[PDB]
Design a protein around this ligand. Structure first.
Ligand code: AKG
Ligand code: FE2
Length: 198
């Protein structure tokens, strides 16, 4: 993964607090399985915190400062989130990265996320910070086409990946979450993706 920086277990120490704050965020903006523009309910449940929140719209996908479900602003990005992200980005070589959106994904057993690209951001030179929590998942990324040599990478609890450079444009997805158990998330996997959407 050219440009990518994988920091395994980087968020192990912050894990517990992050999970507490995810629940906090969920209290204001509950996890919901968004309906794609094509009219299909995603198996992955999501929510957002920060100034902007990624969401499905009628004309496609886009960032909005308002939660379309609660009609209220997305919850603010918790300090735990801000700190872990900055430390990660800085360690990855991006000390200037200032995210304004954190997409929180929740994966129940069997949940998956078919291949896609993240080109909804204004400046693609800005990286994306991914933090995995709970059960392990198989992350798969390819080239520039939906049908390209896909590679696999297991993301475990506390794993952080700063996607910068070329990888920032690579197709990617998550294979069906295998059943299992984790003391902090029980049978769920959470993932935080910090972005500069503004
Ligand atoms: O949970 C994952 O590792 C995938 C998250 C992702 O790429 C996204 O939702 O845009
Ligand atoms: Fe993505």
């Amino acid at each position: 993964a050219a440009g990518a920086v994988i920091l395994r277990r980087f968020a192990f120490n912050a894990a517990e607090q992050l999970i507490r704050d995810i629940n906090d965020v969920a209290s204001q903006s509950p996890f919901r399985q968004m309906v794609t523009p094509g009219g299909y309910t995603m198996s992955v449940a999501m929510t957002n915190c920060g100034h902007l929140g990624w969401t499905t719209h009628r004309q496609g996908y886009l960032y909005s400062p308002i939660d379309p479900q609660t009609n209220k602003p997305w919850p603010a990005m918790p300090q735990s989130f801000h700190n872990l992200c900055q430390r990660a980005a800085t360690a990855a070589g991006y000390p200037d990265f200032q995210p304004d959106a954190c997409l929180i994904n929740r994966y129940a057993p069997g949940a998956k996320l078919s291949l896609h690209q993240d080109k909804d951001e204004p400046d693609l030179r800005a990286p994306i910070v991914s933090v995995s929590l709970g059960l392990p998942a198989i992350f798969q990324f390819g080239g520039l086409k939906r049908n390209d040599p896909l590679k696999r990478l297991l993301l475990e609890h506390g794993d952080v990946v700063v996607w910068g450079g070329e990888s920032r444009l690579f197709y990617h997805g998550i294979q069906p979450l295998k059943a299992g158990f984790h003391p902090l998330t029980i049978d769920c996997r959470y993932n935080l993706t910090f972005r500069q959407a503004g």
